[PDB]
Amino acid sequence: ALAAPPGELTLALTPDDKTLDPASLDRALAILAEHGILVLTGMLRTRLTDQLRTAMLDDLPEVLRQQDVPTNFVPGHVQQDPPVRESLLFPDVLLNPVVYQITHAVLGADARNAVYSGNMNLPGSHEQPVHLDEPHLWPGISHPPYCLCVDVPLIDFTLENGSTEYWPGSHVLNPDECYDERGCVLPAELERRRAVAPPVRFPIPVGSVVIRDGRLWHRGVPNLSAAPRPLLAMTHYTEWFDMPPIQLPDTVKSWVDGSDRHTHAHFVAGDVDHLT
Ligand SMILES: O=C(O)CCC(=O)C(=O)O
Numbered sequence: 001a002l003a004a005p006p007g008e009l010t011l012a013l014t015p016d017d018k019t020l021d022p023a024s025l026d027r028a029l030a031i032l033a034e035h036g037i038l039v040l041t042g043m044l045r046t047r048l049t050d051q052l053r054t055a056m057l058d059d060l061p062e063v064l065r066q067q068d069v070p071t072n073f074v075p076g077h078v079q080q081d082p083p084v085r086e087s088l089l090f091p092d093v094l095l096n097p098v099v100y101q102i103t104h105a106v107l108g109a110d111a112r113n114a115v116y117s118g119n120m121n122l123p124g125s126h127e128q129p130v131h132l133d134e135p136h137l138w139p140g141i142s143h144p145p146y147c148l149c150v151d152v153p154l155i156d157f158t159l160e161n162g163s164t165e166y167w168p169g170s171h172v173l174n175p176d177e178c179y180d181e182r183g184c185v186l187p188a189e190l191e192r193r194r195a196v197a198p199p200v201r202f203p204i205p206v207g208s209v210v211i212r213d214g215r216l217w218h219r220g221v222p223n224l225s226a227a228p229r230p231l232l233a234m235t236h237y238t239e240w241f242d243m244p245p246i247q248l249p250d251t252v253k254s255w256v257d258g259s260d261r262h263t264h265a266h267f268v269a270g271d272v273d274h275l276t
């Protein structure tokens with residue numbers, strides 16, 4: 001069992017950091033290319049993560065009383081969008097300068113955030129199948145990344161409370177017939193890969209940001225704690241990948257639209273209802 005994020009996957013920052021120096025950026029990109037997952041510690045202030053955590057835990061009962069509770073593959077892995085109220089939309093979360101420095105370098109200047117969602121891992125949750133969140137664009141072809149998932153733990157993630165299992169280096173694998181229509185990896189392909197490069201699982205302190213290739217094999221695992229484990233999820237895509245826009249209140253248009261940190265957004269005159 002690991003006690004901390006492995007050194008080879010990790011870059012240590014403070015929330016004051018606005019940009020990586022050239023050497024740090026080179027290393028961030030080398031890690032994303034080789035391993036397909038990068039852990040940035042010390043990115044977000046406690047004041048932001050506290051507010052987002054409280055809001056998602058406060059919203060969980062409304063999510064659980066819906067007619068169809070939207071669940072990811074297996075019981076206890078709940079899809080939950082964080083609020084898009086103006087008071088809970090933070091530039092350092094939506095438009096993080098370090099995150100976009102990395103995504104611009106990997107995916108290009110016109111890369112755009114097209115997801116503002118989240119994952120509530122409930123006490124007694126089941127084991128998700130190993131999957132990729134975004135597919136390879138053609139079967140049996142090696143191609144560069146077109147998307148980067150940006151994961152924001154809203155509490156300390158532990159081995160106990162369902163820190164995500166990640167398969168380092170799996171993002172470049174695209175063998176024939178190995179992914180089903182749900183993006184699940186065939187068990188035979190998992191066992192082949194496990195012999196060459198086994199999965200890792202590690203604690204991630206709140207205030208960290210995980211950047212990973214959208215094609216990285218991973219799985220939610222059981223939350224064996226007494227408390228729901230909230231994750232806030234964003235995904236940066238090349239400009240040419242079709243995605244529906246994020247609905248945002250036109251009250252944040254002033255700072256979201258016209259940034260060189262692009263968001264695929266539709267600005268709405270009223271309130272936006274994130275749960276329905
Ligand atoms: O919340 C997690 O740790 C994993 C969830 C997941 O990977 C998914 O639902 O696609």
Ligand code: NI
Pocket residue numbers: 131132133218219220
């Ligand atoms: Ni997933």
